[PDB]
Design an enzyme around this catalytic site. Structure first.
Site, PDB file in Angstrom:
ATOM      1  N   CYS A 164      36.145   5.633 -41.732  1.00  0.00           N
ATOM      2  CA  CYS A 164      37.097   5.982 -40.697  1.00  0.00           C
ATOM      3  C   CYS A 164      38.522   6.097 -41.222  1.00  0.00           C
ATOM      4  O   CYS A 164      39.438   6.228 -40.417  1.00  0.00           O
ATOM      5  CB  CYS A 164      37.011   4.953 -39.564  1.00  0.00           C
ATOM      6  SG  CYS A 164      35.384   4.956 -38.775  1.00  0.00           S
ATOM      7  N   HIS A 299      45.335   1.535 -35.901  1.00  0.00           N
ATOM      8  CA  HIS A 299      43.955   2.000 -35.987  1.00  0.00           C
ATOM      9  C   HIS A 299      43.177   1.637 -34.731  1.00  0.00           C
ATOM     10  O   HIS A 299      42.396   2.454 -34.225  1.00  0.00           O
ATOM     11  CB  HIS A 299      43.279   1.425 -37.241  1.00  0.00           C
ATOM     12  CG  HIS A 299      41.920   1.999 -37.523  1.00  0.00           C
ATOM     13  ND1 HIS A 299      41.705   3.343 -37.743  1.00  0.00           N
ATOM     14  CD2 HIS A 299      40.703   1.409 -37.600  1.00  0.00           C
ATOM     15  CE1 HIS A 299      40.416   3.553 -37.956  1.00  0.00           C
ATOM     16  NE2 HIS A 299      39.787   2.396 -37.867  1.00  0.00           N
ATOM     17  N   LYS A 329      43.374   5.488 -29.434  1.00  0.00           N
ATOM     18  CA  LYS A 329      41.930   5.450 -29.247  1.00  0.00           C
ATOM     19  C   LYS A 329      41.544   4.891 -27.882  1.00  0.00           C
ATOM     20  O   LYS A 329      40.422   5.143 -27.412  1.00  0.00           O
ATOM     21  CB  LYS A 329      41.274   4.636 -30.360  1.00  0.00           C
ATOM     22  CG  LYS A 329      41.358   5.320 -31.724  1.00  0.00           C
ATOM     23  CD  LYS A 329      40.384   4.697 -32.740  1.00  0.00           C
ATOM     24  CE  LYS A 329      40.540   5.282 -34.157  1.00  0.00           C
ATOM     25  NZ  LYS A 329      41.924   5.128 -34.674  1.00  0.00           N
ATOM     26  N   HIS A 334      36.879   7.160 -30.713  1.00  0.00           N
ATOM     27  CA  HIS A 334      36.986   7.005 -32.159  1.00  0.00           C
ATOM     28  C   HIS A 334      36.221   8.143 -32.820  1.00  0.00           C
ATOM     29  O   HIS A 334      34.982   8.160 -32.809  1.00  0.00           O
ATOM     30  CB  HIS A 334      36.470   5.634 -32.597  1.00  0.00           C
ATOM     31  CG  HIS A 334      36.641   5.377 -34.058  1.00  0.00           C
ATOM     32  ND1 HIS A 334      37.487   6.133 -34.842  1.00  0.00           N
ATOM     33  CD2 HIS A 334      36.221   4.357 -34.836  1.00  0.00           C
ATOM     34  CE1 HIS A 334      37.504   5.642 -36.064  1.00  0.00           C
ATOM     35  NE2 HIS A 334      36.758   4.555 -36.084  1.00  0.00           N
ATOM     36  N   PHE A 391      41.640   2.553 -41.140  1.00  0.00           N
ATOM     37  CA  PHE A 391      40.884   1.621 -41.944  1.00  0.00           C
ATOM     38  C   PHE A 391      39.439   1.992 -41.907  1.00  0.00           C
ATOM     39  O   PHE A 391      38.983   2.685 -40.995  1.00  0.00           O
ATOM     40  CB  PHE A 391      41.081   0.191 -41.455  1.00  0.00           C
ATOM     41  CG  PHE A 391      42.515  -0.220 -41.400  1.00  0.00           C
ATOM     42  CD1 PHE A 391      43.355   0.053 -42.464  1.00  0.00           C
ATOM     43  CD2 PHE A 391      43.026  -0.884 -40.295  1.00  0.00           C
ATOM     44  CE1 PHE A 391      44.697  -0.309 -42.426  1.00  0.00           C
ATOM     45  CE2 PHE A 391      44.351  -1.261 -40.254  1.00  0.00           C
ATOM     46  CZ  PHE A 391      45.194  -0.965 -41.319  1.00  0.00           C
ATOM     47  N   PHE A 393      34.897   0.960 -43.068  1.00  0.00           N
ATOM     48  CA  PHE A 393      33.911   0.078 -43.668  1.00  0.00           C
ATOM     49  C   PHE A 393      34.076   0.170 -45.186  1.00  0.00           C
ATOM     50  O   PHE A 393      34.644   1.144 -45.705  1.00  0.00           O
ATOM     51  CB  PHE A 393      32.496   0.495 -43.269  1.00  0.00           C
ATOM     52  CG  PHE A 393      32.118   0.076 -41.883  1.00  0.00           C
ATOM     53  CD1 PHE A 393      32.923  -0.798 -41.174  1.00  0.00           C
ATOM     54  CD2 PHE A 393      30.938   0.520 -41.304  1.00  0.00           C
ATOM     55  CE1 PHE A 393      32.582  -1.191 -39.891  1.00  0.00           C
ATOM     56  CE2 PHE A 393      30.591   0.137 -40.028  1.00  0.00           C
ATOM     57  CZ  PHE A 393      31.413  -0.725 -39.316  1.00  0.00           C
TER      58      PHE A 393
END
Ligand SMILES: *[C@@H](C(=O)CCCCCCCC)[C@@H](O)C(=O)NCCNC(=O)CCNC(=O)[C@H](O)C(C)(C)COP(*)(=O)O
Ligand SMILES: *[C@@H](C(=O)CCCCCCCC)[C@@H](O)C(=O)NCCNC(=O)CCNC(=O)[C@H](O)C(C)(C)COP(*)(=O)O
Lengths: 405, 76, 406, 77
Positions: A164, A299, A329, A334, A391, A393
């Site tokens: 992301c 984020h 968001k 997202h 940010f 994973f």
């Protein structure tokens, strides 16, 4: 000398607008892009909301080019056309030119068409049902390949993928190309398809919203005590990153200069952030930036864990000098790989049109969000310097800092 | 839709050409802008539409709409 | 645009070897890594040959680490372990270190595991059969995410993806990070899994070799007049890209300096190369390089369309001064995303060990190789400057030039 | 009981988080080296072992060895 990079054009297709005008209106109004998905429910999921693109794309793109594309490429393509128009670039200007490039990606290629291809292989027709077009729809580089080719790009051509943070690293990498003097223009951004094939894998980690399937516009609710995960979205965005002297000499409209780009790594946990990476990321983006952050697009995904760690990192970076924050968001959902570019564009419109958009659906705040300036009503302000975070994973972090000339 | 009408609709949709610019003696490659992957997809769609198999040996021989229409007519 | 970048360590898991010593031996012997594939034949596929990694990976990676990983991430992780050891690097030097980054990608994430999570969801158990580890396996950045996290990387961290140019662009971008002075060390590379789910998509295009399934070691035959498509392969590779002064001051072993990096685009055909973009890419990578290219590792996939177009481009650039050329994919098959770094590694091993690896399986040389020096037998030679090309669908081009340190 | 559930759970959990000899007071995360996703996976394993589906509100509370035994002993299957 190292060069300076500015944004001279943008394009966007998102859950809250099919072009920058529709988006500007939505942002000012706090309008939600979230709707109920009979596709998510039919698949077996517990999340039945999503930020869908409100546009039938069937037949919008020429058969000869759309035959290669998955929806991520479609959305990024449509965004590119608007960005080229916005930047005032004629075909002679950007086509067949070795100083014009493209860096644009997706978080996941096309789960829908990887699944299609396997389902068709295993059926009665075999190869005959697969077709010759699955590879370009499924490869991780589809977004850049399917645009670089029809737009006659001769310069850099590749995708960045970083979950992301994907399209914010694309923008940052495009800036470095300009900085190094390797390109005069780079189209930067990305896109992401919207499908159960990829949504359901997020549900299986319990990362999506489960409780508000009956009240879709409330499910995405960043910084609110009863947030239960993020609302998945699809779409696309593209910006024209241009060297400053080149933009001035041609008379371009300059939204803003990119004065900072941070990219760091947590080196910690595979699915939860560390905040420590984010701290260094924002710090490295603000390095040498002699004006304060007037607004910060967080984020903020409406997750239990995510929202707090970023406020923690925000608190460590800015002292008693904190700036305003909203999580768009909460309206948009997202879009994963397309998130970074879309939020860069929302931030650029806040800068161009001097307002701050609101973080919506905060009925009950969170204690850790105390002392912070989470703007929850549209507010007119002369912004000069804005910052956006993304940010993902694997502990990957990206930050962009954008300032008027 | 007869054999001909089905064949021209397939050709037309895949090559992005109005189903009236599909002349019977048009060449996929020379006249309708097919490339090698269009050639794969067209043969695969025709195969599915009429349940006939078209070996590579035969598919190279089919250069025109009429040759396709003629190939489908004389296999089943 | 001022720092200089060197390779100080490498690691590789390949169809022709599970480390650089095994890879070196195969390269010198011209040994094929291609085998017959039950899986591919079983799927319905016309291509029954592949470049499999001949390695039992059971237990090589900690359980808490490998749970997140597709095969692509596994191969790259094992390659990175090798490369860290080969660079002489210890955790204290590279972990929790903001000046140490990772750029590493795959061509297609994990097709196997995207079909997994979908096959499960549509099955009896639904969400519980899918399980919570499918995103990190199937996401395009899985290679970089699944390595940067357990190796405690703190600097840059992301994947580049560019079809079959993927890991060459990763190395190039690693070099730019050093040049920009943002990083002291960047691990760069890639990995790709080997699975019918992805290979059948290529078979459907007509892209894969199908006429040599009985003699698998002869299916990959770049520049041979009867080549009939590429032979899919999997694996991983990793190189340690390091700022020059930093390398010298720690007494590192230096394989080569990266003295050129080209990255261009055709803007022409989605699946067939224009050749014009390759010319510019090779020219760009040669810019400012005052020594001749001694050896060129072509992209050379064994495709009828692909091989000749690249030869034509090499002619255009070099004219009557052809470098020695060979296509190692005739031995190794095509590892897609991992091809770039593995071929950068073969070229580095040819440079370090003073030999040119052969372009095998050329029974009849295509009429378009005229005026080109295609080396068909192993040749000991003191090389100084080597080049490696990688191209991808979408008209994406990368070229790396590597040169011994004065 | 222990070999009715306590042992079985204890087997389940030791294979899951990979550990040996798990104590009744142990916290999956604080003592047994687990994270969110390990525990998500451990809940699945306890569901296979006892042919039962653990509710979301309940599985949320299963973060210690006792919370696991208490849930399986204090309910159905
Ligand atoms: C997107 C992302 O980075 C990963 C997916 C993108 C690629 C999709 C390709 C599919 C084929 C978002 O997850 C994201 O923005 N992540 C960045 C960090 N934000 C955030 O809110 C953290 C999310 N974590 C959590 O919700 C919990 O930490 C979780 C899931 C680990 C619960 O377990 P435990 O900690 O309780
Ligand atoms: C790899 C590649 O670029 C794609 C990577 C996909 C990543 C994973 C995706 C998972 C779903 C190779 O295809 C490659 O290296 N390609 C570049 C070199 N090209 C080449 O050798 C020629 C390729 N084209 C052809 O052979 C023809 O164009 C063909 C047969 C496909 C169609 O024929 P028509 O043009 O005559």
């Amino acid at each position: 000398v190292s060069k300076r990079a500015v944004i001279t054009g943008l394009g966007i297709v998102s859950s809250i607008g099919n072009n920058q005008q529709e988006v500007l209106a939505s942002l000012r109004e706090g309008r939600s892009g979230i709707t109920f998905s009979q596709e998510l429910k039919d698949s077996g999921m517990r999340s039945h909301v999503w930020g869908n693109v409100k546009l039938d794309t069937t037949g919008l793109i020429d058969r000869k080019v759309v035959r290669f594309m998955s929806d991520a490429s479609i959305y990024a393509f449509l965004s590119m056309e608007q960005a080229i128009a916005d930047a005032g670039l004629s075909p002679e200007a950007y086509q067949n030119n070795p100083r014009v490039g493209l860096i644009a990606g997706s978080g996941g290629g096309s789960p829908r068409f990887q699944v299609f291809g396997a389902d068709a292989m295993r059926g009665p027709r075999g190869l005959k049902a697969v077709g010759p077009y699955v590879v370009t729809k499924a490869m991780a580089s589809g977004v850049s390949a399917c645009l670089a080719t029809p737009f006659k790009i001769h310069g850099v051509n590749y995708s960045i993928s970083s979950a992301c943070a994907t399209s914010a690293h694309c923008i940052g990498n495009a800036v470095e190309q300009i900085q190094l003097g390797k390109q005069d223009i780079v189209f930067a951004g990305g896109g992401e398809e919207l499908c159960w094939e990829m949504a359901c894998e997020f549900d299986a980690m319990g990362a999506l919203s489960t409780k508000y399937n009956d009240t879709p516009e409330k499910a995405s609710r960043t910084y609110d005590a009863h947030r239960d995960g993020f609302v998945i979205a699809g779409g696309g965005g593209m910006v024209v990153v241009e060297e400053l002297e080149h933009a001035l000499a041609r008379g371009a409209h300059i939204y803003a200069e990119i004065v900072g780009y941070g990219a760091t790594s947590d080196g910690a946990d595979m699915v939860a952030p560390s905040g420590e990476g984010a701290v260094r990321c924002m710090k490295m983006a603000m390095h040498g930036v002699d004006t304060p952050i007037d607004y910060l697009n967080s984020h903020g995904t409406s997750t239990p864990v995510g929202d707090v760690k970023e406020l923690a990192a925000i608190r460590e970076v800015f002292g008693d000098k904190s700036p305003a924050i909203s999580a768009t968001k909460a309206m948009t959902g997202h879009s994963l790989g397309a998130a970074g570019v879309q939020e860069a564009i929302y931030s650029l419109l806040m800068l161009e049109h001097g307002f701050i958009a609101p973080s919506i659906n905060i009925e009950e705040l969170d204690e850790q969000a105390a002392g912070l300036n989470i703007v929850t009503e549209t507010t007119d302000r002369e912004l000069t310097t804005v910052m956006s975070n993304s940010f993902g994973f694997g502990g990957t972090n990206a930050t962009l800092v954008m300032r008027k000339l | 839709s007869t054999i001909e009408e089905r064949v021209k609709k397939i050709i037309g949709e895949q090559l992005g050409v109005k189903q009236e610019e599909v002349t019977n003696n048009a060449s996929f490659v020379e006249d309708l802008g097919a490339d090698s992957l269009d050639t794969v997809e067209l043969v695969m769609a025709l195969e599915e539409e009429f349940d006939t198999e078209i070996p590579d040996e035969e598919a190279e021989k089919i250069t025109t709409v009429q040759a396709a229409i003629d190939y489908i007519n004389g296999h089943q």
